[PDB]
Amino acid sequence: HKSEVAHRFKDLGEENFKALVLIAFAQYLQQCPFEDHVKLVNEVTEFAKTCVADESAENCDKSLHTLFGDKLCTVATLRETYGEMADCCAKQEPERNECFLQHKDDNPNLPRLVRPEVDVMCTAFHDNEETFLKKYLYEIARRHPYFYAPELLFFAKRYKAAFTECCQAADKAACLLPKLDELRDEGKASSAKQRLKCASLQKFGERAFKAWAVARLSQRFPKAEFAEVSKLVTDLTKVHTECCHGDLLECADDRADLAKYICENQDSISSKLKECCEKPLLEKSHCIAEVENDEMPADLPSLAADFVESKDVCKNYAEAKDVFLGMFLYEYARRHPDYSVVLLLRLAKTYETTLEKCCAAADPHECYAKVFDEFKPLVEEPQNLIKQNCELFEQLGEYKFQNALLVRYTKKVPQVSTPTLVEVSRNLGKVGSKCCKHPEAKRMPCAEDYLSVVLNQLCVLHEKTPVSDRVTKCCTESLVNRRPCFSALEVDETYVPKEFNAETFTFHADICTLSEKERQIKKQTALVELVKHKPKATKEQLKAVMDDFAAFVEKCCKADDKETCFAEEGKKLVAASQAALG
Numbered sequence: 224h225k226s227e228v229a230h231r232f233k234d235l236g237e238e239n240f241k242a243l244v245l246i247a248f249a250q251y252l253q254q255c256p257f258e259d260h261v262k263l264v265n266e267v268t269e270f271a272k273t274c275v276a277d278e279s280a281e282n283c284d285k286s287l288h289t290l291f292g293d294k295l296c297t298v299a300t301l302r303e304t305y306g307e308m309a310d311c312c313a314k315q316e317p318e319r320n321e322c323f324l325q326h327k328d329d330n331p332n333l334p335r336l337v338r339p340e341v342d343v344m345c346t347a348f349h350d351n352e353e354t355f356l357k358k359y360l361y362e363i364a365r366r367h368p369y370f371y372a373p374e375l376l377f378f379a380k381r382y383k384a385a386f387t388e389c390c391q392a393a394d395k396a397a398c399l400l401p402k403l404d405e406l407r408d409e410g411k412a413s414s415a416k417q418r419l420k421c422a423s424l425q426k427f428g429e430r431a432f433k434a435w436a437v438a439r440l441s442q443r444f445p446k447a448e449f450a451e452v453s454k455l456v457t458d459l460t461k462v463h464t465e466c467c468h469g470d471l472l473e474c475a476d477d478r479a480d481l482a483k484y485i486c487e488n489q490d491s492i493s494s495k496l497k498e499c500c501e502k503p504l505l506e507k508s509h510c511i512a513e514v515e516n517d518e519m520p521a522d523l524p525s526l527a528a529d530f531v532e533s534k535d536v537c538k539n540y541a542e543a544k545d546v547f548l549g550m551f552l553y554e555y556a557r558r559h560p561d562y563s564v565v566l567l568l569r570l571a572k573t574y575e576t577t578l579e580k581c582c583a584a585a586d587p588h589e590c591y592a593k594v595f596d597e598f599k600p601l602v603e604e605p606q607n608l609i610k611q612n613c614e615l616f617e618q619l620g621e622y623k624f625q626n627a628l629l630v631r632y633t634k635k636v637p638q639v640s641t642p643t644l645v646e647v648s649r650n651l652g653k654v655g656s657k658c659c660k661h662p663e664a665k666r667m668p669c670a671e672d673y674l675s676v677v678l679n680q681l682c683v684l685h686e687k688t689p690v691s692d693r694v695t696k697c698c699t700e701s702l703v704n705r706r707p708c709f710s711a712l713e714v715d716e717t718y719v720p721k722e723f724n725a726e727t728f729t730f731h732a733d734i735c736t737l738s739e740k741e742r743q744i745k746k747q748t749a750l751v752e753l754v755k756h757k758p759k760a761t762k763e764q765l766k767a768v769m770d771d772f773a774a775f776v777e778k779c780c781k782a783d784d785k786e787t788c789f790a791e792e793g794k795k796l797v798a799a800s801q802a803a804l805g
């Protein structure tokens with residue numbers, strides 16, 4: 224504690240400092256123009272530099288929280304633009320700040336950000352590279368005010384990389400386009416988990432959050448001691464609570480600290496984190512969070528000894544139920560990095576359930592006797608699902624695989640909107656290609672991580688617009704029974720098919736000139752609709768119809784007076800098909 228700004232400036236750097244101040248000021252005053260924030264950042268940076276000169280310079284003593292709210296309140300148009308928020312400026316510190324993140328908007332009503340043309344971008348990049356990146360940083364900052372600043376800055380650097388490299392290439396687009404698409408989805412996946420992790424905290428509460436982190440932290444640091452895991456799981460949870468609240472500074476410091484701790488006691492935690500601990504302040508935590516699993520020691524005993532044989536399991540259990548279970552988790556976790564965290568939690572719950580319905584019996588040691596036996600089924604189910612689905616993703620391929628899903632889920636919840644079913648089965652197919660790549664050792668974990676966001680993205684929609692009681696059932700269940708529930712959904716026999724169309728099954732020659740992406744969506748949408756008119760159709764009946772329409776498409780997108788092909792030939796298809804599906 225010598226001088227807030229000065230210190231942050233000092234071990235952050237003018238470049239990173241200037242970028243973070245912008246992001247922070249943009250996540251609050253999300254309605255102010257660019258040219259307006261650029262002045263603040265310059266005013267603030269001119270300040271931090273004044274302080275660097277003389278730590279005793281006026282106001283260099285103030286707290287970042289105080290100095291910040293002070294700047295925010297100097298926005299003369301704060302009342303006219305933000306109104307209610309301008310009311311915050313009348314309060315003292317602690318409640319001024321609070322007042323501010325209270326009025327932080329989660330869903331700014333701003334125009335979707337459109338991706339310009341590679342050549343326009345690259346030329347903007349070439350002419351004024353800083354204002355080009357700052358403007359876009361500012362644009363994504365205000366659209367996601369709850370996105371952890373430092374992480375947002377991390378993506379920016381990846382953007383400047385892709386541009387720098389591609390803008391000086393041959394098929395600039397061939398280069399640039401796939402990068403931006405990868406970045407987009409990554410940034411979106413990152414933001415979905417940030418929001419998802421905070422929501423799980425809200426509903427399910429600290430305990431389940433704690434049980435999740437023990438299994439996950441102890442899978443990564445198999446060499447750490449349960450007391451060290453707990454220390455971390457404790458500090459970790461405090462970090463998420465803090466960060467979820469939205470206070471960047473408080474959240475930053477909390478992450479900075481936990482990172483210092485882990486790096487100092489790194490040998491006591493893991494070996495695979497050397498590099499991360501040599502990195503600059505800004506990337507220490509980010510690095511560590513993404514660190515790879517350490518190798519689990521080679522003298523690892525058999526659980527059944529301490530948790531299923533040895534009497535007193537009930538004595539050690541009742542003495543401190545959670546610490547014991549937490550021990551079971553830590554133990555089972557580090558021995559299984561090939562399991563999804565949920566699967567582990569699924570086993571601890573089963574263990575817990577048993578200990579409870581057994582320690583309360585004359586002979587307990589013989590009650591919870593065959594317990595590890597009940598674990599078996601629980602492990603096989605997610606394994607089989609991954610096998611058959613990756614097996615299928617092989618003989619089919621991404622697109623044709625996505626169709627198999629489309630057909631499969633459309634029959635389960637026919638009530639679900641079509642543009643929604645498509646979106647979901649599309650992202651689901653992607654998970655198959657992104658995970659079916661790695662040995663079976665890193666598959667389940669992979670799948671769990673992707674499915675989690677996808678399943679949540681789906682439930683969020685179903686919220687604002689309930690359509691099925693079933694989807695809502697799984698969506699409201701424990702973040703642990705969520706997936707198995709969906710997996711359990713059965714073909715909707717109750718469903719009453721919509722009336723046949725022709726308009727829905729009409730195709731004009733534009734598909735021949737559409738982007739594969741748009742061509743697939745078109746074909747896929749029709750497929751969903753097709754299954755909704757005959758959800759009792761076979762994989763046989765359906766394949767045929769699907770082939771005939773494929774040939775037909777190519778067989779008209781290679782003709783002439785071809786608007787006629789679609790119409791003339793299409794009438795024969797929709798007609799012959801109607802008959803096949805009865």
Ligand SMILES: CCCCCCCCCCCC(=O)O
Nearest residue numbers: 231243475478479504505508
């Ligand atoms: C003027 C405001 C300075 C910005 C404060 C945020 C500092 C972020 C430090 C990185 C913390 C972390 O490791 O996550």
Ligand SMILES: CCCCCCCCCCCC(=O)O
Nearest residue numbers: 431433434548549568571572
């Ligand atoms: C701090 C460790 C606590 C261990 C609790 C064992 C049960 C884990 C499952 C939590 C999720 C749930 O109850 O559905």
Ligand SMILES: CCCCCCCCCCCC(=O)O
Nearest residue numbers: 632636639643644647709710
């Ligand atoms: C949008 C409605 C579709 C709902 C299905 C969600 C898919 C869950 C994936 C679980 C894998 C499986 O068992 O099929």
